[PDB]
Design a protein around this nucleic acid. Structure first.
Lengths: 275, 97, 66, 117, 88
RNA sequence: UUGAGUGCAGAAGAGGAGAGUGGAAUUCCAUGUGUAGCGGUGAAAUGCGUAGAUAUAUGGAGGAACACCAGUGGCGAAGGCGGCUCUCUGGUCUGUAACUGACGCUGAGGCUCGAAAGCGUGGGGAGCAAACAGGAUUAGAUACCCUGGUAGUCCACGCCGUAAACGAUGAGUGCUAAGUGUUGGAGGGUUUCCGCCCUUCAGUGCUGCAGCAAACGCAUUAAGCACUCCGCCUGGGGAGU
């Protein structure tokens, strides 16, 4: 759950942080690791693509499943760890053949569980099933967009998904923000919503702590110069004169539903509620 | 002692008899696993319906009786596996004395 | 001065018996009150719960003038 | 057209107004009337005489497309439903249904308040 | 809440002589196991008001019987409080 | 051993959680038909409809409360508690008496529970609906009337500690005419009793004798006859300031 530090300084006042009560060990294996860089938003061409990144502690990749093509083999699960990469905690893998990897953690994974990834798996949280073997009502993640792959839909900590109604082709699926589309019927996914919850309920407190994360402080709009952002200048404080307030690259920033108008998914999507 | 339970489920009529026997075999074999005791397996009535339920105005009524310790897993296993199959329309479990 | 359901020895209703199920519904399908039934006060509760079991599994409909 | 002679009428009334309409056994709408439709005003749309002449004006258009037998649907308990069905027979049709479909809930939602007039 | 087997068994392991369904060693042993499992329930359905009140009643009544136990004999009293794990 | 509690055999009961689920009704979406109104009032208008409403029929979504049963019925300590079904759990009453042998009651300060409105934190939001708009009446109308419409109104967790929290009658315990139903047991007679009659326990009503009372009135469930323990009060205002 959430710790609350007793107020010692004036900066440690409004602090909140997790417990990490549900982590067994913290000495991961060799083979699943990979190294990394920090691009700091900079290309091959040495220029800042997207602002406000970089400058923090070291991290590494790990190799996490998204396909689960090994089927009809019982999967022993032993430990749940923490990874620097993703908001959600992650768990090791043991196969009875003897192959090891990492797998995401829904709510309710335990030590000594045995998950099944085949098309005939018993319907429990953590199992992997092609979508046609799944009835209506469950909660399903690592939802494949296009088969072969793996997960590209919902991954991060918390959020859920539903199944509204089958057709022949395609399958209806309700995502977050209540926006429901057509998704193919030969896709592989995993049952159950994501694990950790309380990342909506953790403060940062210091400038230093979000700087421990790989971020960077910005600058306000009209606080910019009268050239490098179009609001700028102003004598004293001034309200915005250029109506419908503007990003530094044109593109006003209140209410532009701006997908490409002729995309090849537009004939598959019902009820864009809230974005 | 233990409890006594009627279980009367409503089957699709459009299935075969082989599917009917297979379904009876399947639920009987899975219910005996959690310490439930088989008593009797009656096919109640090929009966129609006073109003429609999902896609039918008929169905099959099959009742079984079963004794089990109250706090085993021989109830909620069936409760989980009943309403996920297609060939079960409705069902009810009542304590029996 | 009024009849009762115990001469026929009512002991256990068992959820299905049309021979007593049909006796105490209305014509439209309502419940006959104990002004009209002539029965024991606990039997009101027995048969009320008995026909509320009946209205799920199709063995008696809710609304019927058709 | 098409000489059906087998349909469904609908009666629907309030304390202040009423509505009559005759449809098919499906029922696609054919021809309708009301006391406001015949031109009577507001508070006066509750008199059963207005229901009589509304049934007249509905049936005289309705039966001319080929129509003799029909069924009767009574929604909306108001006033003139004593007179509406007899004036429906008074233009010479084959009224054969006395039912009551009337929306009773099982106490799911809430009515409005009292009237503190 | 408890089963009639152990209900009829702990009275047959803690009896003074035969047929000692009184004998306030025995009544407080029965109340002891009862308040254990009722407090186990109070762990589970901790929004249930209408059984923690019964915990209050069984605790207070075991208090009363135990208080009456000492004021005629202490050796029974000392043996029980060494025997059933209580008296803070 | 009579008061107490404990056995033993039973019976009733919307007693509390958790968990899943049933039908309608309302409202929205979609489709068919159909065109000139719909809707509102003391009366009329603001409102909605020719970008097809109101109308019907058909399919989906989605909450919300649970018709009939239902009763001066029942359960709880009071606030109260009624769709179904399942896992855990709590009290009440009737015979019983082998067992303990007075273990009892009230109870300052404490501890716990505790409608609705209310706050904080996350969900959800069909109707209803404070605030507010607009129309009408009204000399006047920020109110009564109508069309709307926000919080609120539910769920999850803390918080507050309040009512006309009323039978405006504190708890424990014995004595004192009756009649009258009824909830739930126990016993006897006739009894195919399941149909009746009588006897006895535990509530719940209705009329009344002694008695009490200033009257109103109360009355085996005393507002009578008495004991134990607790709380309260001493003119109205100023003010529970």
């Amino acid at each position: 759950a959430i710790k609350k530090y007793k107020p010692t300084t004036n900066g440690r006042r409004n602090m909140t942080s997790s417990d990490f009560a549900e982590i067994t060990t913290s000495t991961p294996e060799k083979s699943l690791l990979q190294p990394l860089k920090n691009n700091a938003g900079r290309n091959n061409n040495g220029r800042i693509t997207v602002r406000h990144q970089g400058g923090g502690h070291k991290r590494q990749y790990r190799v996490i499943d998204f396909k689960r093509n090994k089927d009809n083999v019982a999967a022993v699960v032993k430990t749940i760890e923490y990874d620097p990469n993703r908001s959600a905690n992650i768990a090791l893998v043991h196969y009875e053949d003897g192959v090891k990897a990492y797998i995401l953690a829904p709510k309710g994974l335990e030590v000594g569980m045995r998950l099944v990834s085949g098309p005939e798996a018993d319907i429990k949280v953590g199992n992997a099933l092609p979508l046609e073997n799944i009835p209506v009502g469950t909660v399903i993640h690592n939802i494949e967009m296009k088969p072969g792959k793996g997960g590209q839909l919902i991954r991060s900590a918390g959020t859920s998904a539903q199944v509204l109604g089958k057709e022949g082709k395609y399958v209806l699926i309700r995502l977050n923000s209540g926006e429901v589309r057509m998704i193919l019927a030969t896709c592989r996914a995993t049952i159950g919503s994501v694990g950790n919850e309380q990342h909506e309920l953790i403060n940062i407190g210091k400038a230093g702590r979000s700087r421990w994360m790989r971020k960077r402080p910005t600058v306000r709009g009209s606080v910019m110069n009268p050239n490098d952002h179009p609001h700028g200048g102003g004598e004293g404080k001034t309200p915005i004169g250029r109506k419908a307030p503007v990003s530094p690259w044109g593109q006003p920033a209140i209410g532009y539903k701006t997908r490409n108008k002729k995309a090849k998914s537009d004939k598959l999507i019902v009820r864009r509620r809230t974005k | 002692q233990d409890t006594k339970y009627e279980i009367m489920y409503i089957i699709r009529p459009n299935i075969d008899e082989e599917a009917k026997t297979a379904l009876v075999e399947r639920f009987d074999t899975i219910l005996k696993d959690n310490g439930a005791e088989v008593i009797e397996s009656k096919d109640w009535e090929k009966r129609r319906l006073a109003y429609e339920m999902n896609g039918f105005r008929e169905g099959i009524y099959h009742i079984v009786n079963v004794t089990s310790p109250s706090t085993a897993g021989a109830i909620n296993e069936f409760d989980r596996l009943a309403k996920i199959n297609d060939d079960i329309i409705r069902h009810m479990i009542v304590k029996v004395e | 001065k009024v009849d009762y359901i115990a001469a026929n020895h009512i002991e256990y209703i068992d959820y299905k018996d049309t021979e007593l199920l049909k006796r105490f519904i209305s014509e439209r399908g309502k419940i006959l009150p104990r002004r009209v039934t002539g029965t024991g006060a606990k039997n009101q509760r027995k048969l009320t719960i008995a026909i509320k079991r009946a209205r799920i599994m199709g063995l008696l409909p809710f609304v019927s003038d058709e | 057209k098409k000489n059906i002679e087998s349909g469904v009428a609908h009666i629907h009334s309030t304390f202040n107004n009423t509505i009559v309409m005759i449809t098919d056994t499906h029922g696609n709408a054919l021809a309708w009337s009301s006391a406001g439709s015949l031109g009577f005003k507001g508070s006066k749309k509750s008199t059963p005489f207005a229901a009589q002449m509304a049934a007249e004006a509905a049936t005289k258009v309705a039966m001319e497309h080929g129509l003799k037998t029909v069924d009767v649907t009574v929604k909306g308990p108001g006033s003139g439903r004593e007179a509406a069905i007899r004036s429906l027979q008074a233009t010479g049709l084959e009224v054969t249904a006395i039912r009551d479909v009337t929306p009773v809930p099982h106490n799911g939602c809430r009515p409005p308040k009292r009237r503190r007039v | 809440a408890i089963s009639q087997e152990r209900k009829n068994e702990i009275i047959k392991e803690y009896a003074r002589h035969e047929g000692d369904t009184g004998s306030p060693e025995v009544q407080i042993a029965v109340l002891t196991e009862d308040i254990n499992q009722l407090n186990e329930h109070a762990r589970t359905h901790k929004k249930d008001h209408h059984s923690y009140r019964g915990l209050m009643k069984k605790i207070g009544h075991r208090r009363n019987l135990l208080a009456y136990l000492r004021k005629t004999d202490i050796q029974r009293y000392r043996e029980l409080i060494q025997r059933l794990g209580l008296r803070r």
